[PDB]
Design a protein around this motif. Structure first.
Motif, mmCIF file in Angstrom:
data_model
loop_
_atom_site.group_PDB
_atom_site.id
_atom_site.type_symbol
_atom_site.label_atom_id
_atom_site.label_comp_id
_atom_site.label_asym_id
_atom_site.label_seq_id
_atom_site.Cartn_x
_atom_site.Cartn_y
_atom_site.Cartn_z
ATOM 1 N N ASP A 1 0.613 -0.905 0.295
ATOM 2 C CA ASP A 1 0.059 -0.181 -0.107
ATOM 3 C C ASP A 1 1.090 1.370 0.016
ATOM 4 O O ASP A 1 1.600 1.606 1.268
ATOM 5 C CB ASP A 1 -0.777 0.303 1.460
ATOM 6 C CG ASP A 1 -2.067 1.103 1.108
ATOM 7 O OD1 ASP A 1 -1.812 1.654 0.129
ATOM 8 O OD2 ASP A 1 -3.082 1.246 2.200
ATOM 9 N N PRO A 2 1.035 2.323 -1.702
ATOM 10 C CA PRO A 2 2.083 3.267 -1.168
ATOM 11 C C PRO A 2 1.615 4.570 -0.239
ATOM 12 O O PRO A 2 2.434 5.106 -0.060
ATOM 13 C CB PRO A 2 1.879 3.422 -2.630
ATOM 14 C CG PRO A 2 1.003 2.147 -3.548
ATOM 15 C CD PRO A 2 -0.194 1.787 -2.547
ATOM 16 N N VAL A 3 -0.448 4.574 0.233
ATOM 17 C CA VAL A 3 -0.282 5.566 1.017
ATOM 18 C C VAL A 3 1.030 4.974 2.214
ATOM 19 O O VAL A 3 1.496 5.739 2.851
ATOM 20 C CB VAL A 3 -1.381 5.429 0.509
ATOM 21 C CG1 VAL A 3 -1.744 6.705 2.082
ATOM 22 C CG2 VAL A 3 -2.215 6.626 -0.398
ATOM 23 N N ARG A 4 0.572 3.791 2.471
ATOM 24 C CA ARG A 4 0.660 3.017 4.163
ATOM 25 C C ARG A 4 2.375 3.460 4.065
ATOM 26 O O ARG A 4 3.244 3.841 5.235
ATOM 27 C CB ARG A 4 0.254 1.317 4.338
ATOM 28 C CG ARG A 4 1.212 1.519 5.537
ATOM 29 C CD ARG A 4 1.006 1.815 6.229
ATOM 30 N NE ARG A 4 1.423 1.055 7.908
ATOM 31 C CZ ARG A 4 2.503 0.639 8.889
ATOM 32 N NH1 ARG A 4 1.554 1.788 9.145
ATOM 33 N NH2 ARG A 4 2.786 0.695 9.450
ATOM 34 N N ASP A 5 3.157 2.829 2.999
ATOM 35 C CA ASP A 5 4.679 2.822 2.844
ATOM 36 C C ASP A 5 5.371 4.534 2.946
ATOM 37 O O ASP A 5 6.224 4.855 3.513
ATOM 38 C CB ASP A 5 4.986 2.498 1.445
ATOM 39 C CG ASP A 5 4.334 0.523 1.871
ATOM 40 O OD1 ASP A 5 4.192 0.506 3.146
ATOM 41 O OD2 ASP A 5 4.424 -0.127 0.675
ATOM 42 N N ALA A 6 4.643 5.349 2.153
ATOM 43 C CA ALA A 6 5.449 6.352 2.247
ATOM 44 C C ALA A 6 4.721 6.943 3.467
ATOM 45 O O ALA A 6 5.796 8.111 4.190
ATOM 46 C CB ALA A 6 4.197 7.514 1.246
ATOM 47 N N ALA A 7 3.873 6.593 4.195
ATOM 48 C CA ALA A 7 3.894 7.528 5.501
ATOM 49 C C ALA A 7 5.116 6.972 6.451
ATOM 50 O O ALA A 7 4.830 7.269 7.169
ATOM 51 C CB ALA A 7 3.032 6.658 6.472
ATOM 52 N N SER A 8 5.381 6.031 5.748
ATOM 53 C CA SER A 8 6.303 5.501 6.885
ATOM 54 C C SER A 8 7.526 6.579 7.245
ATOM 55 O O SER A 8 8.583 6.936 7.595
ATOM 56 C CB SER A 8 6.742 3.821 6.308
ATOM 57 O OG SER A 8 8.289 3.565 7.504
ATOM 58 N N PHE A 9 7.670 7.240 6.381
ATOM 59 C CA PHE A 9 9.029 8.499 6.097
ATOM 60 C C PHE A 9 8.389 9.331 6.903
ATOM 61 O O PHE A 9 9.505 10.147 7.384
ATOM 62 C CB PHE A 9 9.034 8.387 4.673
ATOM 63 C CG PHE A 9 9.755 7.786 3.175
ATOM 64 C CD1 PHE A 9 11.438 8.232 3.226
ATOM 65 C CD2 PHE A 9 8.888 6.828 3.026
ATOM 66 C CE1 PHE A 9 11.780 6.773 2.703
ATOM 67 C CE2 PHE A 9 9.775 5.644 2.361
ATOM 68 C CZ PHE A 9 11.053 5.974 1.859
ATOM 69 N N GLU A 10 7.451 9.854 6.468
ATOM 70 C CA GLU A 10 6.940 10.661 7.743
ATOM 71 C C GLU A 10 6.897 10.031 9.342
ATOM 72 O O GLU A 10 7.334 11.407 10.312
ATOM 73 C CB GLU A 10 5.053 11.277 7.620
ATOM 74 C CG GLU A 10 4.509 12.685 8.119
ATOM 75 C CD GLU A 10 4.383 13.742 7.206
ATOM 76 O OE1 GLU A 10 3.642 14.796 7.789
ATOM 77 O OE2 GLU A 10 3.789 13.118 6.532
ATOM 78 N N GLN A 11 6.480 9.188 9.791
ATOM 79 C CA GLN A 11 6.748 8.961 11.052
ATOM 80 C C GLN A 11 8.170 8.057 11.133
ATOM 81 O O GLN A 11 8.776 8.926 12.389
ATOM 82 C CB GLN A 11 6.589 6.957 10.884
ATOM 83 C CG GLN A 11 6.868 6.486 12.157
ATOM 84 C CD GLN A 11 5.698 6.690 13.803
ATOM 85 O OE1 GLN A 11 4.325 6.989 13.385
ATOM 86 N NE2 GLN A 11 6.538 7.797 14.560
ATOM 87 N N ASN A 12 9.265 8.894 10.669
ATOM 88 C CA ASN A 12 10.736 8.755 10.981
ATOM 89 C C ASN A 12 10.932 9.804 11.241
ATOM 90 O O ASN A 12 11.567 10.217 12.275
ATOM 91 C CB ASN A 12 11.427 8.511 9.390
ATOM 92 C CG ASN A 12 12.659 7.905 9.799
ATOM 93 O OD1 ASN A 12 13.247 7.100 10.569
ATOM 94 N ND2 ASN A 12 13.601 7.954 8.672
#
Ligand SMILES: [Ca+2]
Ligand SMILES: [Ca+2]
Ligand SMILES: [Zn+2]
Ligand SMILES: [Zn+2]
Lengths: 406, 406
Positions: A103-114
């Motif tokens: 899920d690209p949205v979920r995965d991209a969000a991983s960068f913001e959680q970082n």
């Protein structure tokens, strides 16, 4: 004039091993770029990482650039339910490269959680100019590039939906990439629309042999690795690099921004005495020696915030040349001499916005065939123009054609 | 010329009630600013919120500005363990205003989580220029301001450590604020360093009587509320507003950016037929009528992205005047006529950066006594100057004095 410019980039930190890596860089008189995963700060990344915070601090205090490699290196796509043991569980299966992106949205969000986690453990991190977590990123497993509007390319076989590249019966078809690859591509675009640049690598400083109990011991020696760097210089390595999952098949060979430059990829964990071998004892000397002889050969070392050259007052630019200004990429519209008061912007007649994004943006030189997003809708550029506030896609139907879906 | 400018701002959405609120605004021919909490999208905000996503979409499609009010309106500080029932649990205790802020880092992070959730449920949200979730914010419970370097003030009694403002024995001492207030102040600063502006309010459109079963029914009528707006115009309302926890005690009365403007605060949930009364049936007409007669009285309506006037080509500026350009606040250094190619920036001689931040920043006009953060250290400005790349605090000990701690 330098023979070329080397960009040392270290992935998967911050961990205990990072501390001595940074000290060697400091003794060597060079800066480097660290693409970090913040989950090591939480102590769930399945590495020796009790000094993670200390390393993050030392990296920034020493003036090294910190970039974004996602919170958990996409390990949430390697397991069923992400938790404190997920890193260990994925290491047990070794399925990192399978279904790496879903899920690209979920995965991209991983960068913001970082960013949240980094700014949690180091609340003063934004006071460091060399903190670029919100501007510079690199995707796990993937030699993918989002540098400028006309400088971008994906790792079309970086990750798989079933078999690993070395397993029997593995098939890589760049023309019809895996679902995982397709997801990573969308992730690239999401990050690009958030203002990120992403950079791949030219050469990968890694073990010459993974078929031994201490593969770290086989890390390429300094003299040999310089030869590999020499060979990479102006040779479009991203297309010829091995293994296949490290390729950037459609990399724009000879593209001006890439000339006379070599980005080195390596990992902090290859420089520690641990489960991969005696990396500290054996490889730290290789790093120190490489830096020395690379300088002797006429190379200079720089960081990824400068990969795209910063706009500089006094310099003359030719129409078509690219610069980076306040984190935004610009392309010269007319040849001129850069003055203090005439910097690039969203209203300048001297520059246009050339970020590698797809959302409709001001002062971009749009060409026929370009596709932009605007208020949840996709529009095709029908006639070339430079965008401005008045000419929004939803009102300019001579400049834009609304695309249909399904 | 308008009698003044009104900024309608709605807090605590998006919820079902938001849909009709937006439709009334659209019929009225006005734009407004919505400060949203994304937890309603997850369905745990304890409101009628099954149409939350629909409302978010309608707000953005209609051209309304979306701002950041934090993910969970700080309800994680109202309970022991934050979960799906926390909103209900806090409503049972009514302890919203007690210990509202505790760990500023954790609380500030709530605003970034908000962006993740918004961009999760509406993946195309960044394609809307009127999406300002990452530029504009407002703190729950708190009439606090971070507008410019010289335009900022806090709600010194917004939240408490024990008693509510109405409870017997309540004491508010602006000179020695509660721990909760102190935390909210640090939160303001953290957000400001992330590039946020924050805005409070002049007047609050709320029930005239909370001591009835349907308090929403007592929402101020249109004609009366216009009188309150008229009275607020150029009268420094933030200092005189009631109740006390809504005050901005040290608001800079008569500050140029605040002249001839009135920011209206209200809540979406006051306009629905539900647990607060017949808000839809009764109050939606009040909203529609207010908009009409306000226009008749000579008011215009604008949104918070314009509260600080955007830089405009052709306009002349006097030294000391403030503008907003690409989300950044600038102050004119010398009087001049704004040209297409001479916009504000970090290198312009015509403008200096005047964001309400505290981290060391380029091209800021620093004054004696100012305190900045740089690479994890605090420095006091000893002599006035305009910052530039060369003059970093760690090297310029004639311009900066390193502060000691504890
Ligand atoms: Ca950027
Ligand atoms: Ca800003
Ligand atoms: Zn990695
Ligand atoms: Zn609120």
């Amino acid at each position: 004039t330098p023979k070329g410019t080397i960009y040392l980039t270290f992935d998967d930190g911050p961990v205990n091993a990072s501390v001595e890596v940074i000290k060697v860089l400091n003794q060597g008189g060079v800066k480097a770029t660290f693409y970090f995963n913040a989950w090591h700060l939480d102590g769930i990344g399945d590495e020796n990482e009790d000094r993670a915070l200390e390393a993050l601090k030392l990296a920034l205090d020493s003036g090294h650039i910190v970039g974004n490699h996602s919170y958990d290196h996409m390990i949430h796509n390697c397991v069923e339910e992400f938790g404190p043991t997920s890193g260990a569980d994925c290491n047990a299966t070794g399925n990192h490269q399978i279904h790496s992106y879903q899920d690209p949205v979920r995965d991209a969000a991983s960068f913001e959680q970082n960013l949240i986690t980094l700014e949690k453990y180091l609340p003063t991190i934004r006071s460091y100019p060399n903190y670029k977590g919100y501007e510079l990123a690199r995707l796990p497993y993937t030699n993918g590039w989002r540098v400028t509007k006309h400088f971008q390319a994906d790792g079309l076989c970086a990750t798989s939906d079933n078999l690993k590249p070395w397993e029997p019966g593995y098939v890589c078809d760049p023309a019809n990439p895996s679902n995982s690859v397709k997801a990573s591509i969308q992730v690239q675009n999401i990050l690009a629309n958030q203002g990120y640049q992403t950079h791949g690598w030219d050469v990968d400083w890694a073990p010459e042999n993974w078929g031994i109990p201490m593969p770290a011991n086989s890390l390429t020696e300094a003299v040999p690795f310089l030869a590999y760097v020499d060979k990479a210089l102006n040779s479009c390595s991203p297309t010829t690099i091995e293994p296949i999952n490290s390729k950037t098949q459609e990399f724009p060979c000879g593209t001006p921004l890439h000339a006379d430059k070599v980005i080195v990829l390596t990992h902090d964990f290859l420089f520690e005495d641990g489960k991969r071998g005696m990396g500290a004892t054996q490889n730290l000397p290789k790093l120190a020696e490489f830096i020395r002889i690379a300088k002797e050969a006429g190379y200079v070392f720089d960081t990824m915030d400068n990969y795209t050259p910063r706009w500089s007052v006094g310099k003359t630019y030719q129409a078509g040349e690219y610069v980076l200004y306040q984190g935004v990429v610009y392309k010269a519209v007319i040849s001129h001499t850069a003055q203090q008061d005439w910097a690039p912007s969203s209203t300048s007649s001297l520059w246009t916005n050339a970020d590698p994004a797809t959302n409709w943006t001001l002062n971009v030189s749009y060409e026929q065939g370009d596709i932009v997003n605007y208020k949840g809708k996709r529009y095709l550029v029908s006639v070339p123009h430079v965008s401005q506030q008045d000419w929004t896609p939803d009102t300019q139907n001579t400049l834009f054609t609304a695309l249909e879906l399904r």
